[model samples]
Target chain A: GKVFLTNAFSINMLKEFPTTITIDKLDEEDFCLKLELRLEDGTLINAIGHDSTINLVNTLCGTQLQKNRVEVKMNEGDEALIIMISQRLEEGKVLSDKEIKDMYRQGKISFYEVWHH
Target chain B: GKVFLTNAFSINMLKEFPTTITIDKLDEEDFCLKLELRLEDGTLINAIGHDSTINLVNTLCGTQLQKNRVEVKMNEGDEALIIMISQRLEEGKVLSDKEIKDMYRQGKISFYEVWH
Candidate 1:
């Protein structure tokens, strides 16, 4: 469930729905965007390059992450992409159990996995 | 959040997202459909009359209810439209907290009310 790129603009896409996400910048000199996503089935998808990473996130995971200073945090230890969002919301808004189960029943989601919080 | 109609087609759609729903037929000699929806903010929208009720549900609430027997349940006392699905998925699939909050933050949803 990984996404590689030649230029990162002609972005690669996946059908599996993303459940969680983590993102940060590659470095100061390198404004390359690195985005990692956790799919609903617990697969890690990584995408790297330039302007298209945010678009990728928006298209696949339905997020609107801007290239603002407040959204991207600089992590000196990584020496690479800053980790703006990393596993922050585990106990947040959740679909009702009946709704999740119904989604499974209706085949909206590929499959049903327990929301392990 | 009530959606009334004279004929039920040319539906009156709503901008507010529906969080829950209840449906049953009006009566036997009458195949008229009566649909009631509970919006995300707890507003009740009711739509009744002929063929367009399911379409209304699909358009506004994003449900794919078929006219098949397995989906709708007929209530003896209710008489008209059977209660195919009524208050079934309250604890069903939901968006994650982060996702919901992000949707609220990004203005995808009209407002952020507690998922009660």
Candidate 2:
């Protein structure tokens, strides 16, 4: 029988805007992108790297914006970032709407828009 | 959208001498009277009661003591009975000086007032 395990990740995305990401054993070949939002408390919103599609947007018009893609990979038995967004929201902390939009425009933040699994 | 709800109430008042009352809800027509007191185990005291007016005598003094008129209303909710006299001088449950006077003037055996 396989043993069940719980894993967690805490990512602090402060710099390196427009980064692309990938996780190990997640895809046959395709990688995913993740956006990080900065909070007023000097903490970065550690959005999970999996479970959604990411999209960069413009601050002014909320339009889809383009940015450089960064790649990341996760291996089997490796921990991925989950419970990241929920924890941040639970702390009663969040990026303001204006700031989020601004970050999106600057490629500082991206969206995890879909759930493949 | 709207939803329906139900409510319940429970009250326990032991009437050996001093009675305690607890309440809930709102009523439009009702009378109200309450005297708060505390007691220790194994002490005894007195208890009394009257309507809007009462004619009682002073237990200490052999003279007639004029009672006050107590006309109370629930204001706008369920009515509550508010007539009674009680004491807490020697300490059984209640600890109010006025209550002690009422109970002393009246003949009531309180749990704490029990010498045993």
Candidate 3:
């Protein structure tokens, strides 16, 4: 399977989603940021698919802390901008498999191909 | 095999070492940055293990260059910060499989999971 992964910032900004929202903020100014995964491009034989598992390793917050926060907004072709605020998470934390799945469900994340099909 | 990769920034921060040094500073500020890996964690049933090979995809510098600067610090647990200043490395360049192990022996990188 052709798998492509990107940094958190890029994923949120470029990918399309069905839902969008902010998280972990005491106020609008007090939120960290995140993007939810909803769908993936299947032009490639191994691209991430609907209900497929995406893993975030060595991220700002390890799997346990950031997993549930991630939720998929809708299946691959929704048009929402799912956003998340990390509050105060630092770098180097890894996201678990469960979190990856959750993000897909919440419409928080999505995938696309830059070049190859 | 269980393969784990991280952003260039974090890899240089908390892993062990066998070798160490700074990169890309023409004098002290002309270099992009990176960390080499020599070993990995294998305590769990699916923990990343050594030479077993690591992958640095979605990194700052995607795999391409060779005769690189990522020198490993040591094996599994050592002390040396393999720092690669991204003077302008930007971000989002995935490392090829070949690049991951290369950094390991250069004494430029290592790995240690912080929790679980």
Candidate 4:
């Protein structure tokens, strides 16, 4: 769970994916990117796994994307500071027991049918 | 990007997906969990996006699954505290020009076949 960040960059300034994400869904999975981004300033950040990856993706390419998770990786020996992101999304409606389950069930939506012009 | 947190829960105690994650590659996508976790305490948290979800997943179910990403949600006046998780994973070697590209290219690895 502890990823060793061995760069010389700061962690709060990374706001974009290091590379252009390719979400073709070849794995029968949702649109996601597991990337090791090498920045212009020599900062390298690796994003692997699923839930969190999707978390980052939804925010980046979605309608509202600033309040989503923002990432920045820096170097320090590399030991001086630590950074983590926790994002919570809530709607303005109080739902019924059935509505709650169905709403969450809809989170399964993906990026497969939308790469259009 | 600016998600609305309308619950009364603190964001510091969620760690598991509400439902089981299924990675089949139908969308040419990798493994991901976009969940609305409603706990017994009535705390709900939604995790979307790719980069951050992967960050949390890598730490949640890998060799070293503690320091990746952690989530927690608790009640707080429908709004008291906001929580965000940032996870950084690195290896023990300085990479090469070709190797860095290759390692990162490898980062595209996924979790479909292993579920069996």
Candidate 5:
């Protein structure tokens, strides 16, 4: 219902932050996606985004969208902001060091870390 | 979320029936109105209509839209189907014959019923 991002610059910047996002609704005719984004500060927002905007999140988050939500985190460096995604955890789960190492080696822990980030 | 009407023929035909319509939502940028139409046969519909479509309904129903809704009635004839409108009764409003006659004389009963 509200236009959240206008240009590619803001969109590119949005991808650089830590936010939990899920598709609230999609306007197929207009190729627009309405998303429910929860900021790290606990602010909830209803965001309306367009075609390429959808693709940016789609590619960054991968296609494994679920009702469980997606967890996005970022690390800012001198050169750029590095974005990362991991499966959203609801209850409790433990990972061994070897499993973590394997995930990192396979680029699964921080998959779709944004090529230009 | 869904498209209900395609063109003017279906739209014009829709105006000829008895129904209760209320605006569910509006896309101002696109000049579109999403309406909830309750048909006489007890069927409920979500209708998406464009600019002129909104205008047609707006004119026929008059601008006295309220949470109470609008009652649309029509009588089909050889020349044309005449449409009419009245405030939707919720429970206990009363109108005398003079009041109804006054409404008809002032063209209020059939006001904006549609110009030829």
Candidate 6:
């Protein structure tokens, strides 16, 4: 199956968001996450894409995460974290645990993406 | 709605297991994980309670975690680990991140449930 969320975030988490829209999902199945893109003015994307992941948000948002830099050294079992960071960067975001922790230490959002491909 | 697996375990992960049996599931919905219980006899428990967690394994296996002990100190932003640890015990195990790391340092498994 296509690896979706880093598994760091629970798949069921979307149900918690008032703005979420689901295109498809099932028990024991890999499904896509669909998101609504807020745009400038009345022009808006009703939904980004089926099975959409923030990994691709930069593509739609017209920006990207530049810190594609691997800022930390990993321990033996740190494969999961590496995969998360790499995969997220592939879509233009940082799923780095360092970022998560730092944000927890200092965080929120209206959302701004760094611009790139 | 229901706090099933620690958000630590992704809800969509079950699709990865061939042994997994899904009683009910939906995308973005809280799910019950039914695990097949191995027994001494040829008889086996096909699945545990709906939305079950290893948290209750000790209860079903007729055992409970003895280390119900809080082995590690949690820090700010550690709520996820604490909730996972406490809730796992609510069933009968320790989902302690400390133990997870230690085990990662020294690990493997046939699986043994600590008897209470």
- TM of chain B, each: 0.20, 0.16, 0.23, 0.19, 0.25, 0.17
- What CAPRI grade goes to candidate 4? incorrect
2 against 3, candidate with superior lDDT = 3
Instruction: Give the residue spans of candidate 5 off by over 4 A.
Output: A1-80, A111-117, B1-116
For model 3 chain B, the run of ten residues with the poorest summed lDDT: B23-32
Tens digit of lDDT per residue, candidate 1, span A1-117?
222222111001111121112222232122222323332333322333333334433443344544322212112221122222212223333545464435435643321111101
Any runs in candidate 6 off by more than 4 Å, and if so which? Answer: A1-8, A11-36, A39-61, A64-117, B1-8, B11-83, B86-116
Candidate 6: fnat, from 0 to 1? 0.08
lDDT tens string, model 2, B39-114? 1221111122331122222322222324433222111212232222333234234334465345534543111110
Q: What TM-score does prediction 2 earn?
A: 0.14
Candidate 2 docking classification? incorrect
- Considering only N, C-alpha and C atoms within 3 Å, which residue pairs clash in candidate 5? none
Model 4, span B1-116: residue lDDT tens: 11222111211222222211111221112221211222223442333233433343434323111232323332212211111222233534343345433433564322211010
> Candidate 5 lDDT, tens digit per residue, B8-105?
11112223322222111112212222222322222322232333333344443332222222233222321111223243322343454455456556
lDDT tens per residue, model 3, B2-66: 22222232222323322221211111111112222322243112121221122232132332222
Write one digit per residue (lDDT tens) for candidate 1, span B1-116: 22232221110121122111222223211222233333333332233332333443344434454432221121222111221221222343454545433543554422111110
lDDT tens per residue, model 5, A1-117: 112222111112223322222111112212222222322223322131333323333443332222222222222321111212244322333444465446545654321111121
Identify the CAPRI category of the predicted complex in candidate 3. Answer: incorrect
Which ranges in model 2 have alpha carbons more than 4 Å from their true place?
Answer: A1-94, A111-117, B1-116
TM-score of each: 0.16, 0.14, 0.18, 0.15, 0.17, 0.23
Residue A93, candidate 5: alpha-carbon lDDT: 37
lDDT of 3 at A3: 22
Candidate that beats the other on lDDT, 1 or 4, i.e. the better one: 1
**Residue B106 of model 1: what lDDT?**
57
On TM-score, the stronger of 2 and 3 is 3
